[PDB]
Amino acid sequence: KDAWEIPRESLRLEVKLGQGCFGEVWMGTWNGTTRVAIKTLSPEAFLQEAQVMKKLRHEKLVQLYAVVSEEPIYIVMEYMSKGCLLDFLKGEMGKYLRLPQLVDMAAQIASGMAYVERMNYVHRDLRAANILVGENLVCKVADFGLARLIFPIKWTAPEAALYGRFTIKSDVWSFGILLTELTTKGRVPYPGMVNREVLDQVERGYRMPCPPECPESLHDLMCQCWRKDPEERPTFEYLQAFLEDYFTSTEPQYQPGENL
Ligand SMILES: C=CC(=O)Nc1ccc2c(Nc3cc[nH]n3)nc(-c3ccccc3)nc2c1
């Protein structure tokens, strides 16, 4: 057992905030007067996630803090006040998010994902459900299960979905798809397309259209995201940089609109 391991004690669970799939997510207080997030639930399968999170630190990736390696097993990490980006965009505070905010958030996540590019790590689950928001419109990557050193198809790339080939380039696919919700106020992609329709449609060569009120600027970008050859797709250094400089070098004339 290692430095990351802690006594089951000094941590109680104040609240319960999730448990959609297998386990539980509460928000307690830790190690004195420290607020945390705890995940609960091959008892090891659950912790393959922090074995990964152990090796990664970035300010735009939710951070681990401790993990109770023994059952009842838990993973302690940094609490993010504003739930997950999905609920956030669909929900009440999402009404007043215009492009600037929406593009901003994007970059933070590109940025964390640029780092993931650095460490030769892959996330096979990039979707606004796996991004957590904080005070200040701070967004960080999460859901570190599924991640290894280098399966819904709306969010997933074809090579991977079909042949299991999961690059960072396949994470990149998911980023484009995610851009749309960011700009769709949380909508499920491929509206009215079912998981069979989506597969050869997407093979058919077919990409989503410009979300209403979007700038084609961001659409050629997503589009670049969905290129069929995984290796001509951009990267998170490129995306991150493109995203940050966007309203000065990209759309430096953008004017505010009703819904964006
Ligand atoms: C009006 C509703 C509201 O504020 N709800 C909140 C707030 C914070 C949540 C949160 N924070 C976490 C989780 C991991 N780090 N921070 N995490 C989670 C969560 C995350 C994964 C699975 C289930 C729940 N939900 C939150 C919900």
Curated annotation (Swiss-Prot):
Detail which positions bind ATP: L17, G18, Q19, G20, C21, F22, G23, E24, V25, K39
Q: Give the modified residues of type S-nitrosocysteine.
A: C225
Q: What is the effect of changing C225A?
A: Significant reduction in S-nitrosylation
Q: How is it modified after translation?
A: Dephosphorylated at Tyr-254 by PTPRJ. Phosphorylated on Tyr-254 by c-Src kinase (CSK). The phosphorylated form is termed pp60c-src. S-nitrosylation is important for activation of its kinase activity.
Q: At what positions is Phosphotyrosine found?
A: Y163, Y254
Q: Where is the Protein kinase domain?
A: 11-247
Give compartment(s). Answer: Cell membrane; Mitochondrion inner membrane; Endosome membrane; Nucleus
Q: In which tissues is it expressed?
A: Expressed to high levels, and with a high degree of kinase activity, in certain fully differentiated cells such as neurons, platelets and macrophages. Isoform 1 is widely expressed. Isoform 2 is expressed only in the muscle.
Which residues does the entry assign to the active site, renumbered to this chain?
D125
Q: Which domain of life is it from?
A: Eukaryota
Q: Which family does it belong to?
A: Belongs to the protein kinase superfamily. Tyr protein kinase family. SRC subfamily.
- Quaternary structure and partners: Forms a complex with polyoma virus middle T antigen. Interacts with AFAP-110. Interacts with GJA1 and PXN.
Q: What does this protein do?
A: Non-receptor protein tyrosine kinase which is activated following engagement of many different classes of cellular receptors including immune response receptors, integrins and other adhesion receptors, receptor protein tyrosine kinases, G protein-coupled receptors as well as cytokine receptors. Participates in signaling pathways that control a diverse spectrum of biological activities including gene transcription, immune response, cell adhesion, cell cycle progression, apoptosis, migration, and transformation.
Q: What is this protein called?
A: Proto-oncogene tyrosine-protein kinase Src
Q: Which organism is it from?
A: Gallus gallus
The gene it comes from is SRC
Q: Which residues of the full protein are shown?
A: 257 to 533 of 533
